[PDB]
Write a protein that binds this ligand. Structure first.
Ligand SMILES: [Hg+2]
Ligand SMILES: [Zn+2]
Length: 257
């Protein structure tokens, strides 16, 4: 099926998923001199105090930290969003080298990795229904650069050994996503899509300007993951990012200036 290699990668996705060439595809390049400050943006509200993680899963493309979304707990609201969006999972995209890995780019700059915290609009009852709606999802995107270690990421790093291959999962309770947030909540926002098939055009993107710094040894451990299933030829899980897609006259707004 779809992947990131030469024969099943982003350039092939359009065949099974025609929407790959659609009008609001993600990621995009954020041209900082074209994005306009928007005075009508409300303050962004990230409320992760009562977040309840359940488990971590290697799905053969990335790893997802999944949350219990059966109650209103970890929610994103404010900014460009109307109503309340519930955290369901987070995952990352990363490179084989520090000079690449992010999906969004900033004035064509690629970061070492990108964190996606995926939330669904609670007016639609659940995730599956939300992804049938143009405002069904909100994704908080956070860039990763290589420098000082991120202490709040280490619990994730340490569990990766138990989920090396496609299909493996581990109990992952009491993880606090607040340990993954940078100081500032300044952001760019635009309407877009999921960056993995089925590439559904249901996302309000909120991409934070301030990256988090992770250590070289932290990202190195990301790179020890496998795309393949256990007992199969080893294919390192690296470069699981989709490159920037056409903006198509969409408007990127900034929360700051
Ligand atoms: Hg949609
Ligand atoms: Zn993602």
């Amino acid at each position: 099926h779809w992947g990131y290699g030469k024969h099943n990668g982003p350039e092939h996705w359009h065949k099974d998923f025609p929407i790959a060439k659609g009008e609001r595809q993600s990621p995009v390049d954020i041209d900082t001199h074209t994005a306009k400050y928007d005075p009508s943006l409300k303050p962004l509200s990230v409320s992760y105090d009562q977040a309840t993680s359940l488990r971590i899963l290697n799905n053969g493309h990335a790893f997802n930290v999944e949350f219990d979304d059966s109650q209103d707990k970890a929610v994103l609201k404010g900014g460009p969003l109307d109503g309340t969006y519930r955290l369901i999972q987070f995952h990352f995209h990363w490179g084989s080298l520090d000079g690449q890995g992010s999906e969004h780019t900033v004035d064509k700059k690629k970061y070492a990795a990108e964190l996606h915290l995926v939330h669904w609009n609670t007016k639609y009852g659940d995730f599956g229904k939300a992804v049938q709606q143009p405002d069904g999802l909100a994704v908080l995107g956070i860039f990763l650069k290589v420098g000082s270690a991120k202490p709040g990421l280490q619990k994730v790093v340490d569990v990766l050994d138990s989920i090396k291959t496609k299909g493996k999962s581990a109990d992952f309770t009491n993880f606090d996503p607040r340990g993954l947030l940078p100081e500032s909540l300044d952001y760019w926002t635009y309407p877009g899509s999921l960056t993995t098939p089925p590439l559904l055009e249901c996302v309000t993107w909120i991409v934070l300007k301030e990256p988090i710094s992770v250590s070289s040894e932290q990202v190195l451990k990301f790179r020890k993951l496998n795309f393949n299933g256990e007992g199969e030829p080893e294919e390192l899980m690296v470069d699981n990012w989709r490159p920037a897609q056409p903006l198509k006259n969409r408007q990127i707004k900034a929360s700051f200036k």
